[PDB]
């Protein structure tokens, strides 16, 4: 009896941290036509309905949203999808030509003076020996003067040739589910006050993650998930100011963005089967694009985030909000895509407040660009075709990306500024509750068994 | 109602249960192990790697004389050095994760002992078959 012997068990429920290649799944409804979408993937298998989520009682797991894999994989997959959706489209090599530009004083407002240029240029036709004189409207951010006459060129012409986005392909994000392959499991942290790292007392195993929409934006997380109980402040090292602070709201803040210009699209034949979609005359008045948020709602949300930040920086601390220090237009502005148009909004009014220890709306102007450098890459630029009519979109601000300034000693004041630029933080805000583990089905334990001779 | 037992019968449903109780749901994990351009290449590589891992595990089990069995009793006696813990403690209090953490140090020693025991048993079978 006291003589115990080794018994071998296969299929034991034990696992370890591991990295693998998850396979994406998309909702079946997405397969109803609408194949023209950047994120529409044929690889993504149909979503298994009535998903099953098994709760692992008494199991405590260690999570780390900052060293987490399955965020780098998501970044890579999104970038690859973006490139794949751009391969078949037109390369705008002929567009790198001298332009004779002039201002559009055609019922513009004082804030839109010089923002639009009326540029005329010679272009190749479908016949190699013929040329056409055409004109288009270009945003001042897309053309740079070259030096009487005033000649311009596209900003990208000394770096690379831009690929025109296919007009039928949509930029609207669609939910994507990441699923574990054979021999692997995805563990979900069900704790509602989880700060992204450390043990998670409440754990469950899921076949696939919740549908995560690949929303690309800076300084403001849009259309994401909301904290269930309180505003969550998450940082790899809160004391270290070099680390971005990810803020998750418990209630959304509605943001209304519009491009009030009635744009007109114009097709120009660049070559055999090649079309360049230019911008024709704007029908009506020319006015600045802008976004609106409720003043009271934003103030309440800022008060809440300040309340949660004081838990990390002391009660009697002055918390200040300031606009971006500087950098490229992508990071210093709230960048996002609104119905196929790319916005660059000046959020200086959203982050203008100092908080003491004790029906109006905020209109923040926005600028439009058509030459897009996504994923912080250089040499791969995309030209966004113009969109006819008036653009309008409504979104939820579900979080922030903040950066703290290095203060000398303890100056009883902390100033936070909006950040972003690295989309891995955007995915990280949705995958913080997930991890991938590898099953280890082989187990040896003492049992009072003995084999024959 | 379906009942909470179906959860116990789900994948990793017994991960938190006592190893004695988790020993009755081995087949779930065992079957999950075989569940079924660059994206296609990566998916194919993952599938091939999973197949290779499963085959390596099966080859190990066969090398221990445990081929085709999910629970296999052996001839290797249990060393008190590996764990002086009682039987009731192990099979009614701990879970497989805790037990794996405890005995992770001696796993290779146990594997080598199992291999040696199977080799000795095979040659003893062959020698008794040298006698019959």
């Amino acid at each position, epitope marked *: 009896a006291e003589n115990l012997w080794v018994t071998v068990y296969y299929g034991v429920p034990v696992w370890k941290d591991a990295e693998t290649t998850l396979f994406c799944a998309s909702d079946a409804k997405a397969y109803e036509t609408e194949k023209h979408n950047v994120w529409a993937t044929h690889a993504c298998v149909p979503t298994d309905p009535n998903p099953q989520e098994i709760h692992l009682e008494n199991v405590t797991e260690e999570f780390n949203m900052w060293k987490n894999n399955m965020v780098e994989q998501m970044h890579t997959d999104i970038i690859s999808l973006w490139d794949q959706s751009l391969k078949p489209c037109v390369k705008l090599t002929p567009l790198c030509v001298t332009l004779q530009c002039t201002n559009v004083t055609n019922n513009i407002t004082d804030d839109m003076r010089g923002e639009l240029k009326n540029c005329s240029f010679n272009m190749t036709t479908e016949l190699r020996d013929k040329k056409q004189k055409v004109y288009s409207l270009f945003y001042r951010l897309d053309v740079v003067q070259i030096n009487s006459n005033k000649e311009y060129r596209l900003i990208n012409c000394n770096t690379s040739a831009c690929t025109q986005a296919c007009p039928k392909v949509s930029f609207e994000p669609i939910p994507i589910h990441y699923c574990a392959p054979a021999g692997f499991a995805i563990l979900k942290c069900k704790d509602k006050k989880f700060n992204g790292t450390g043990p998670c007392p409440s754990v469950s195993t899921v076949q696939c993650t919740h549908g995560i929409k690949p929303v690309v934006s800076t300084q403001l997380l849009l259309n994401g998930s909301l904290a269930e109980e309180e505003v969550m402040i998450r940082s790899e090292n809160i004391t270290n100011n070099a680390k971005n602070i990810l803020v998750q709201f418990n209630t959304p803040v509605q943001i209304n963005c519009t491009r009030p210009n009635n744009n007109t699209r114009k097709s120009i034949r660049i070559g055999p089967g090649q079309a360049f979609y230019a911008t024709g005359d704007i029908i009506g008045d020319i006015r600045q694009a802008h976004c609106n948020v409720s003043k009271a709602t934003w103030n309440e949300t800022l008060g809440k985030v300040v309340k949660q930040l004081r838990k990390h920086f002391g009660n009697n601390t002055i918390i200040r909000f300031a606009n971006s220090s500087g950098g490229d237009l992508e990071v210093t502005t709230h960048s996002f895509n609104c119905g196929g148009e790319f916005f660059y909004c000046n959020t200086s009014g959203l982050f203008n407040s100092t908080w003491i220890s004790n029906n109006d709306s905020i209109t923040l102007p926005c600028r439009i660009k058509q030459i897009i450098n996504m994923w912080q890459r250089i040499g791969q630029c995309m030209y966004a075709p113009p969109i006819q009519g008036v653009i309008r979109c409504v979104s939820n601000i579900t979080g922030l990306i903040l950066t703290r300034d290095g203060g000398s000693t303890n100056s009883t004041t902390e100033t936070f500024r909006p950040g972003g630029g690295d989309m891995r933080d955007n995915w990280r805000s949705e995958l913080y509750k997930y991890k991938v583990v590898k099953i280890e089905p082989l187990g040896v334990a003492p049992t009072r068994c003995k084999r024959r001779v | 109602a379906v*009942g909470i037992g179906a959860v116990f019968l789900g994948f990793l449903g017994a991960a938190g249960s*006592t190893m004695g109780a988790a020993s009755m749901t081995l087949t779930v994990q065992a079957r999950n192990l075989l569940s079924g351009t660059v994206w296609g290449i990566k998916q194919l590589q993952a599938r091939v790697l999973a197949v290779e891992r499963y085959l390596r595990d099966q080859q190990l089990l066969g090398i221990w004389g445990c081929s085709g069995k999910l629970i296999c009793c052996t001839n290797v006696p249990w060393n008190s050095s590996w764990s002086n813990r009682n039987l009731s403690e192990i099979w009614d209090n701990m879970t497989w994760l805790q037990w794996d953490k405890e005995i992770s140090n001696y796993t290779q020693i146990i594997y080598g002992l199992l291999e040696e025991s199977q080799n000795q048993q095979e040659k003893n079978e062959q020698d008794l078959l040298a006698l019959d």
Partner: antibody
Amino acid sequence: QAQLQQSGTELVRPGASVTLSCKASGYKFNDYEIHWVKQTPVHGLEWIGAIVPETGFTAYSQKFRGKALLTADKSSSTVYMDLRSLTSADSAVFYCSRLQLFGYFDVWGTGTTVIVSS
Amino acid sequence: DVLMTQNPLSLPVSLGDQASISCRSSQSVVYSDGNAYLEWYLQKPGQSPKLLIYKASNRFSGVPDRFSASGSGTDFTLRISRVETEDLGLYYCFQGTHIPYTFGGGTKLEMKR
């Protein structure tokens, strides 16, 4: 004669732990799994947990996870709840009920009115 | 997670009439096996809850033909015909597919004199 018997009334002080019981008789204990539901007029009927006597698997709900501790004895065919850190909100009637896989709560208990008072 | 909404809170009815109880689920209740485990339970004053219908369509055990339930997915309804004095009590709808299970808000049947 499948019946479930539980204690009638237990009066204890707040911050203490009470041990209830649910005697299973007249039917094979193993086959069915015993569930518990509280009967309160403010929060309504809620499910606490359910045990399978065979494997001892204990399933809980997040609304009463933690303090609720459920144990069973196969020999005596008994299922107990050990509820700790009792407050006024815990005073209600607890029904112990049996269930089968893909079955139904065919038979229930008589209830157990618990009062938390010093 | 599975919110079980039951309406109306009170359902007055005269003896011999028909009373209808509506109970709506927040999400789908159909399990992977294909069956929907939604049950209706009745609690009399001073008595423990009693099962009436299981599977939302099948009768528990020779319960009256008066007690008939129907519905699908989000919407489920229990109908009681020829109301009798013994039918007084609280009716509760309950789903048993997704853990944790939840009970209905409760409908108080009231007989009329």
